[PDB]
Amino acid sequence: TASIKLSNGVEMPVIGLGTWQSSPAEVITAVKTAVKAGYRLIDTASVYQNEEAIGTAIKELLEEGVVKREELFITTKAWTHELAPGKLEGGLRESLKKLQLEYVDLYLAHMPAAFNDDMSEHIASPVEDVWRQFDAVYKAGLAKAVGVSNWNNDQISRALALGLTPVHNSQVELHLYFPQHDHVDFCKKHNISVTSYATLGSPGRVNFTLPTGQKLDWAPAPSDLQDQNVLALAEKTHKTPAQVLLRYALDRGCAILPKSIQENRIKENFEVFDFSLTEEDIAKLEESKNSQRLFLQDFMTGHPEDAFAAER
């Protein structure tokens, strides 16, 4: 299994199944298809409300003898209300119950901003206090590694400065049209692994279908998948545009989480280990200089720990 070695020695598969776009019913089929295809990492979150289904999927995989627990890397994330003082452990234990696991391989703060139950009120808990809870669950053995998602460099630095368990991973939006050069360089400096979500960028096609259901010809849409350099490299390597975008992120030194839920796409996204991109190739793909954050997570607007406050 191709993996990245975390600062504490834990090996994390470089490619995993992102489940943020999967319902409980769709995720079961998606997880089993991915694992049978070769995927060894499953990424979920308490807020997706699909952990129970994933637990069932894993259970079936184990009974079928497809894989053993030790061969799978499971990542989950605490939502905003679970980040509040003294609420993390309870949240993690609940996720473990749904997943039917004794521990998770990686546990992340889904955001840096705490909220109450219905997110009607901000809870001004500094990221330092949030991280102390992660340090605790890590030491308790409930998570083999801990990290953050959607945090900015300053927030991560504040967590590191505490001198507790280091941040092992940072999961952020990262794709050709939002390179995150600064964040990746920052993480590399502090030995923090980086996981890219939304690796395939924005919608690359617009489909036309008649009421009868008859499918007509599609049209390209402005996106990473339609970038001229991407299309050119795909043709030259005999790979698909999507595979090129995934390889781009991998060779940038990141782990990836393609969201595809369709059987054929899940299989397609895994076929990215028969080639690699050189520094020249990477530079060529970045020539358009297009850069724009697609996931603004604007519900954080006004919160003292809004990671993107400067962009509001």
Count of beta carbons in the 10 Å neighbourhood of residue 121: 9
Q: What are residue 123's phi and psi, to 5 degrees?
A: -120, 110
Is 1-312 CATH 3.40.50.300?
A: no
Q: Rounded to whole angstroms, how far apart are CA atoms 134 and 132?
A: 5
Residues contributing to the annotated binding site for substrate: 110
Q: Which of 225, 181, 218, 187 is nearest to 203 (CA)?
A: 225
Residues linked to residue 123 through DSSP beta bridges, in sequence order: 114
Distance from first CA to last CA of the chain, Å, rounded? 41
Q: Rounded to whole angstroms, how far apart are CA atoms 292 and 153?
A: 18
Burial of 288 by CB count in 10 Å (0-12 exposed, 13-18 middle, 19+ buried)?
middle
- Would strands 11-13 and 3-5 be described as parallel, antiparallel, or unpaired? antiparallel
> Side chain identity at 191, as an amino acid letter?
N
Q: Which of 284, 267, 306 is nearest to 15 (CA)?
A: 267
How does DSSP assign 143-184, residue by residue? BSSEEEES--HHHHHHHHTT-SSPP-EEEEE-BTTB--HHHH
Resolution to one decimal, Å: 1.6
Q: Rounded to whole angstroms, how far apart are CA atoms 137 and 119?
A: 24
Residues in contact with 67: Cβ distance below 8 Å, sequence separation at least 6, in sequence order: 35, 40, 61
Residues contributing to the annotated binding site: 110
Is residue 73 helix, strand or coil? strand
Residues in contact with 131: Cβ distance below 8 Å, sequence separation at least 6, in sequence order: 109, 159, 162, 164, 167
Q: Rounded to whole angstroms, how far apart are CA atoms 273 and 270?
A: 8
Active site residues: 48
Residues in contact with 181: Cβ distance below 8 Å, sequence separation at least 6, in sequence order: none
Is residue 107 helix, strand or coil? strand
